[PDB]
Amino acid sequence: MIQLMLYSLIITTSIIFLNMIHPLALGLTLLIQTIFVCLLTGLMTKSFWYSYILFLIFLGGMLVLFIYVTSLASNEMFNLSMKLTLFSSLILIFMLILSFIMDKTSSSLFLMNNDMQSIINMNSYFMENSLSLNKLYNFPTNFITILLMNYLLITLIVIVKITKL
Amino acid sequence: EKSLHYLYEENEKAQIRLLEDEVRRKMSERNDYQAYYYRPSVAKYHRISKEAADELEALRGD
Amino acid sequence: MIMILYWSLPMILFILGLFCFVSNRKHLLSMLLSLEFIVLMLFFMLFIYLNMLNYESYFSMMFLTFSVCEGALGLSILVSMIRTHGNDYFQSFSI
Amino acid sequence: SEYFGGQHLYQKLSMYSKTLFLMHNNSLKIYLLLFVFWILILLILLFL
Amino acid sequence: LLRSKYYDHPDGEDAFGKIVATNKYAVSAGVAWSMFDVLTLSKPQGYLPTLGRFAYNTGPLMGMATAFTLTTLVATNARGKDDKINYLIGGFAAGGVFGAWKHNHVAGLCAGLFLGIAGVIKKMSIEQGWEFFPNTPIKQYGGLNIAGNDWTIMADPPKNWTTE
Amino acid sequence: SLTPFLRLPLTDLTGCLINHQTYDKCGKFEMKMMECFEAYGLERGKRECADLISDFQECVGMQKQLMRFHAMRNERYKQWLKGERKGQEFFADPPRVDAY
Amino acid sequence: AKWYPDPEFMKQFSGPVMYPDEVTSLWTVPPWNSK
Amino acid sequence: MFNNSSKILFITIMIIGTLITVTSNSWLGAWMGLEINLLSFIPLLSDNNNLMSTEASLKYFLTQVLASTVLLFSSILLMLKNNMNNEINESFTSMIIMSALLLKSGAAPFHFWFPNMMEGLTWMNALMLMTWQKIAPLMLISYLNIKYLLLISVILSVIIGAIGGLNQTSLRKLMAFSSINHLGWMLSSLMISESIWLIYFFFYSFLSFVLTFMFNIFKLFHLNQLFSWFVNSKILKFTLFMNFLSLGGLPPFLGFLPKWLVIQQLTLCNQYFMLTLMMMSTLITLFFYLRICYSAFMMNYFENNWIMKMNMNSINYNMYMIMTFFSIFGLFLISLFYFMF
Amino acid sequence: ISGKTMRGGPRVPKAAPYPYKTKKYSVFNAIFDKTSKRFDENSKVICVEGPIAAGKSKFAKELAEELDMEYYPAVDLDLIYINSYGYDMRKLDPQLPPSCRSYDVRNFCLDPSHDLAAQFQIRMYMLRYSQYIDALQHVLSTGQGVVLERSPYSDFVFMEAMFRQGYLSRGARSVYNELRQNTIGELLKPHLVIYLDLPVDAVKKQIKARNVDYEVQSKVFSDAYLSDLEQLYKQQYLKDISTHAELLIYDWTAGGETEVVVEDIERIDFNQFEADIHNKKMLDWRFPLEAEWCEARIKYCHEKPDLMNYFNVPRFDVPELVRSADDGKVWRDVWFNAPGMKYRPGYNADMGDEGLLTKTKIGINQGI
Numbered sequence A: 001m002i003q004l005m006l007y008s009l010i011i012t013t014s015i016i017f018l019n020m021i022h023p024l025a026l027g028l029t030l031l032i033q034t035i036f037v038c039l040l041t042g043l044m045t046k047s048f049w050y051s052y053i054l055f056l057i058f059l060g061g062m063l064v065l066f067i068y069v070t071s072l073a074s075n076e077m078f079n080l081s082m083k084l085t086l087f088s089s090l091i092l093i094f095m096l097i098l099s100f101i102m103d104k105t106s107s108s109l110f111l112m113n114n115d116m117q118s119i120i121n122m123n124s125y126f127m128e129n130s131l132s133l134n135k136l137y138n139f140p141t142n143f144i145t146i147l148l149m150n151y152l153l154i155t156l157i158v159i160v161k162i163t164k165l
Numbered sequence B: 001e002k003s004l005h006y007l008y009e010e011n012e013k014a015q016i017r018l019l020e021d022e023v024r025r026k027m028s029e030r031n032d033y034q035a036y037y038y039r040p041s042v043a044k045y046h047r048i049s050k051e052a053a054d055e056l057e058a059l060r061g062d
Numbered sequence C: 001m002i003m004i005l006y007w008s009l010p011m012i013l014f015i016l017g018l019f020c021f022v023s024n025r026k027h028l029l030s031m032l033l034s035l036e037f038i039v040l041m042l043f044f045m046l047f048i049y050l051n052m053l054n055y056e057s058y059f060s061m062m063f064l065t066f067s068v069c070e071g072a073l074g075l076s077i078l079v080s081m082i083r084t085h086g087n088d089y090f091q092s093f094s095i
Numbered sequence D: 001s002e003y004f005g006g007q008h009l010y011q012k013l014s015m016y017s018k019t020l021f022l023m024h025n026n027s028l029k030i031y032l033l034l035f036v037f038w039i040l041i042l043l044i045l046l047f048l
Numbered sequence E: 001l002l003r004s005k006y007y008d009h010p011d012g013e014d015a016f017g018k019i020v021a022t023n024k025y026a027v028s029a030g031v032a033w034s035m036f037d038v039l040t041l042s043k044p045q046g047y048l049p050t051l052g053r054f055a056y057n058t059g060p061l062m063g064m065a066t067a068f069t070l071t072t073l074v075a076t077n078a079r080g081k082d083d084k085i086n087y088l089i090g091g092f093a094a095g096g097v098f099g100a101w102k103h104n105h106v107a108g109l110c111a112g113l114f115l116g117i118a119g120v121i122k123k124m125s126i127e128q129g130w131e132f133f134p135n136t137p138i139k140q141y142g143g144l145n146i147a148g149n150d151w152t153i154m155a156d157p158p159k160n161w162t163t164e
Numbered sequence F: 001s002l003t004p005f006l007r008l009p010l011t012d013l014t015g016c017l018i019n020h021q022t023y024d025k026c027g028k029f030e031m032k033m034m035e036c037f038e039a040y041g042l043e044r045g046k047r048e049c050a051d052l053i054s055d056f057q058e059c060v061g062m063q064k065q066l067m068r069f070h071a072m073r074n075e076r077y078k079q080w081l082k083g084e085r086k087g088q089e090f091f092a093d094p095p096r097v098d099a100y
Numbered sequence G: 001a002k003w004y005p006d007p008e009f010m011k012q013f014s015g016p017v018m019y020p021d022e023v024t025s026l027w028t029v030p031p032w033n034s035k
Numbered sequence H: 001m002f003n004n005s006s007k008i009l010f011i012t013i014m015i016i017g018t019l020i021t022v023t024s025n026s027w028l029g030a031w032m033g034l035e036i037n038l039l040s041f042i043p044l045l046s047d048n049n050n051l052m053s054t055e056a057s058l059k060y061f062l063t064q065v066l067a068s069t070v071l072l073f074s075s076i077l078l079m080l081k082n083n084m085n086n087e088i089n090e091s092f093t094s095m096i097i098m099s100a101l102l103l104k105s106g107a108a109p110f111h112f113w114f115p116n117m118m119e120g121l122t123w124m125n126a127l128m129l130m131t132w133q134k135i136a137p138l139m140l141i142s143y144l145n146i147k148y149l150l151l152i153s154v155i156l157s158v159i160i161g162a163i164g165g166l167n168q169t170s171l172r173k174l175m176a177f178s179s180i181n182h183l184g185w186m187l188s189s190l191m192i193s194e195s196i197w198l199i200y201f202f203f204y205s206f207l208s209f210v211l212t213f214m215f216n217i218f219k220l221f222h223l224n225q226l227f228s229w230f231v232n233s234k235i236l237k238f239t240l241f242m243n244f245l246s247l248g249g250l251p252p253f254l255g256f257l258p259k260w261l262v263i264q265q266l267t268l269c270n271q272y273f274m275l276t277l278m279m280m281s282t283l284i285t286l287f288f289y290l291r292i293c294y295s296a297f298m299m300n301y302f303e304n305n306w307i308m309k310m311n312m313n314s315i316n317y318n319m320y321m322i323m324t325f326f327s328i329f330g331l332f333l334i335s336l337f338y339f340m341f
Numbered sequence I: 001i002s003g004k005t006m007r008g009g010p011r012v013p014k015a016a017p018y019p020y021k022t023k024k025y026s027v028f029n030a031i032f033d034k035t036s037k038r039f040d041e042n043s044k045v046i047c048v049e050g051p052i053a054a055g056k057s058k059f060a061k062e063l064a065e066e067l068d069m070e071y072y073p074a075v076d077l078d079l080i081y082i083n084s085y086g087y088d089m090r091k092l093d094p095q096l097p098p099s100c101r102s103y104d105v106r107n108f109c110l111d112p113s114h115d116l117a118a119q120f121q122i123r124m125y126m127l128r129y130s131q132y133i134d135a136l137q138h139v140l141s142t143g144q145g146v147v148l149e150r151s152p153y154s155d156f157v158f159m160e161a162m163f164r165q166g167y168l169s170r171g172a173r174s175v176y177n178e179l180r181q182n183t184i185g186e187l188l189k190p191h192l193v194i195y196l197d198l199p200v201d202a203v204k205k206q207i208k209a210r211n212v213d214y215e216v217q218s219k220v221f222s223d224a225y226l227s228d229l230e231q232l233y234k235q236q237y238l239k240d241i242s243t244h245a246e247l248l249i250y251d252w253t254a255g256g257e258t259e260v261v262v263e264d265i266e267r268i269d270f271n272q273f274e275a276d277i278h279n280k281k282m283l284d285w286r287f288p289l290e291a292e293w294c295e296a297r298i299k300y301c302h303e304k305p306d307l308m309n310y311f312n313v314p315r316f317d318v319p320e321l322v323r324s325a326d327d328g329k330v331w332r333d334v335w336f337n338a339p340g341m342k343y344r345p346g347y348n349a350d351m352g353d354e355g356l357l358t359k360t361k362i363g364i365n366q367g368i
């Protein structure tokens, strides 16, 4: 049910993202889309680690650059329209009552949670967020995360050169 | 006799060229031999990952 | 079918973000924000793929690192024209 | 002969090169929009 | 009905499948050219002249297609012979129709010569039995020593399959 | 899996990144496909090894099981809309909460 | 060896495009150091 | 382009990222390498002295990230349909993958960014663009088995890349349009072999190095600038301009060899009409190559008289004259070659 | 800048002088040998500008020997017409066609209305532009400052001066403006500019006092040409260069004193312009990093063929700057079959060179 609520909220924020043109308003629409995307990717998974990782990296880490650039880009304020708010509310109530009149068992995702797994599954009882993150720090896939940290340092070296400081 | 020898050499080269064209066509039709027309798909990385996952079962403990 | 009921919505919103990326009624900052919208939809679809497998979800912070470096690269490209094209280049409707 | 020959071939190629330079005087968003439509028909047929 | 090909039946056997096949090829070519037309050169504004340019660039190609197919069927059924000069007459007719859209008499024949040449070459392909774009019988996926080119540092674990 | 064009030292890290070999419901199916791709290669493995391909795709892709589930749920709703099944017997005996 | 390329011959290469039209005749050449 | 050691660092990391792309055994590690190559090719193609290079880097960024996200989306879609990287019967998701690769490579339905970006660059970043940056998409195109997309791309590349270079009098856009036509010969070789493509690409790369070194050492950006170029002996200017006839595919010089091997392998693969469509549309490429050769094939010109000394680099022109010799006398080495077979 | 009198001795270098005339400076040489380690207060570029009769060679010589810098002399067209072996190419004038003969400033002094004069000024620019980079290679690679009698920034004054008297057409102005707009943005502006002010009559007085045989009995130095150039200096070139370079007006109508202008130079504080990053003065020499300093040294010590190949503008619409093809052919057959320039310099065995069978040393920034 709440997965369908997040579907409806993402649809509504995407169509208002298509409608609006003010750059900080699109930045605000992105920062409120990232929360719903984080929660909706939290519904399929065993545990909410990667939603937290996407949260710190994308919203609190990266989009603040977008919010700063779009804040200094536009001198003017938002022109709030009650027509777009009314249309968003109408399509939101329509999509929630459409989720009310729809069977939620067929519309639920087939991806297993931590409790949707079998009871006799030995690997699920060990430690939360342990076996999924294991391949980051084991042979031979540790070279990718070493290359990722090197890639981030090289990215900073690129950014200092292209902005010319 | 020089022209006879050169014609014999060129005719035998023609037969070997036709035969290797036929052999290459039958090799590319079926992708059978391991020299040409063969894409080597290896499961070395899958076996390495399976051996690592079997090795980390012993490492599981306290 | 399976595609109609599962993972149909990330495709539709990906095409909507692609059309917002390339429309002539928008500007360069709107292109970059719609680009990070399709980055978010790509994360959604990639996580739906990666959760059919049990313990390969660690790839989600690899694509995150690459696309966040792409976004910082695009912002640093776009603001490098401030000292050359002026502060009015953000309102450019054409390239 | 030069019509259905080299002179008229050169004139037609010059006209085709002049009318293709008008394709390349547009913004990048038009060509990226053409790519987005080519993805769009390639995904409509995936439904069908 | 809409999946009918041009050569699923012999010449003069059915008309409607040939009209649908040649017209759907003309519609595909006209839409593919018109999508690159109205965004790049002579860009219109509004819903009406955009659809007008789409009709102006697609419908004449449909007229060329149906005129070539109709005079090809007329030249095939007017006699007992099924040969390449019926395709020559059809190419001349399609070039003459194209000329009318151009409004130039010279353009119509000049087009009919090349379309008749294309028609007799395609009828030669039908008669002799070869294809314009065949599948490749040979496709070199790589050169020699393709098994000894594995320059990898990782040691191979022992395989689970044998040849015995 | 894709055969890379070049086999350099730089494929050693990328190759192990995604694979059902780490504990999974049916990575032992995928191994039975993958060694088959060592036997016939990639292109003869598409033809001579088609039975082991469909089992792995059936297992992790979950295509026909979900299609059968949707066929069993849409037929029940069609019987509800056609008046054959109605009332408190619309849904059957539910499973126990620790059954699966 | 009697005719050599005159400046009239290299006049046609001096434009912004090889074959000017009503759109590209008002264009200007790029700077010769390409910056 | 060697003003800093950081650019050498970006060159070796873009080499590393391209090698990660072309050796990836999955469709996602190839995208990882594509992003590494993109990160290291954004600061090259950007400079402070040239104003157009920054907006050209913006065009490159938008074109590549549009192509890379469609490449990622279609690869994830393929993995969602069938969970192996290959596909038994080819479908529309491989078409979206190949179209996203063709936007990266610059095939003629998606090539309109290529000369429009090339109109404001230098001659060394162009050398990186038409040679090394064509490695990463084209080596992934060989993994797909659809024919009609390659057919449309080859046909459109050889007509559009040859006709569109006639109006251009700038040397960079003309070389970009010539590389678009030489791209189509590489994709026509990709449908029949994965080795004849390497032959054509290596010698096309060789011709690109030796021909873009003529315009980089002497700083030539225009067709009229070739007529005012001062060479102390006009026989040397006539000899140095034979690389255009070499790259156009003329039999005594090198550059006839890879085109001839493509002709030999396509006729053996029973594809005759597409070969005729390419070779009737490669004469226009030799026509705008011979329009460059107006400035050297005649033996005397109405030169501007203020410049009387030819100024040139030493190491770069020392590397140039080795490769100019093998561009026109390189057909003697066909007896030593064994990589055709 | 500190003089020798207050310092009590000669200046000391902060590092070893790089042999910039022998060894190239690429990025692999820029990894080891840094270039900001040898810079001090006496690393400025000083241009001593003035009218044509003012004493500037003697003043620049005593300023170079007083401030411990290197004096770069004024350019003259003997540098083209005399090769490296010392042979004069003015003796090839009967062999050359009359549209391609020699034209030095002596031929300008007697015949200013000749068609080669519009070439001649451009040639003068090609000797100022080639000198300043040769000045800049002394600043960045050795750390010693340079002083120049003439600069390429001030060469357009002579161009409009010959235009106003009527010696140049409008097309010559257009092609010189195109060459200047193509080239002047690639070299760093000087730190300091000295203008030795002279009235128009005292210039004529010093011209007749010098008694050079082509300056006398020449109609070029009238009361309009000298007045045009001294006006054009102070209201175009000085106003352009004062945004970057410090400008010192000195009343040189007397004999002129040297210690007072060294005192006037020494009270100028050179560190106050580096406080503001976006300041217009000394903007071209404001390199915040060592990598930008090494890039600036690479641009003039290694990329001088690029800046000399930037003179490749095609402009064929002028008839007096286009060498005809038969005249160009016989000019090549005369000039490049000379004893001096049959081959490249250092490899001509006809004029006394030995050991050519084992010699593969080209040289650095050598005209071919």
Ligand SMILES: Nc1nc2c(ncn2[C@H]2C[C@H](O)[C@@H](COP(=O)(O)OP(=O)(O)OP(=O)(O)O)O2)c(=O)[nH]1
Pocket: I051, I052, I053, I054, I055, I056, I057, I058, I074, I105, I108, I121, I124, I149, I155, I158, I162, I215
């Ligand atoms: N046409 C032309 N003549 C020039 C140019 N530069 C200098 N001259 C001529 C004009 C005068 O005859 C003479 C200028 O004299 P200088 O500036 O060399 O000074 P001079 O040597 O007289 O004194 P000084 O060395 O400064 O003490 O050379 C130039 O760019 N163009």
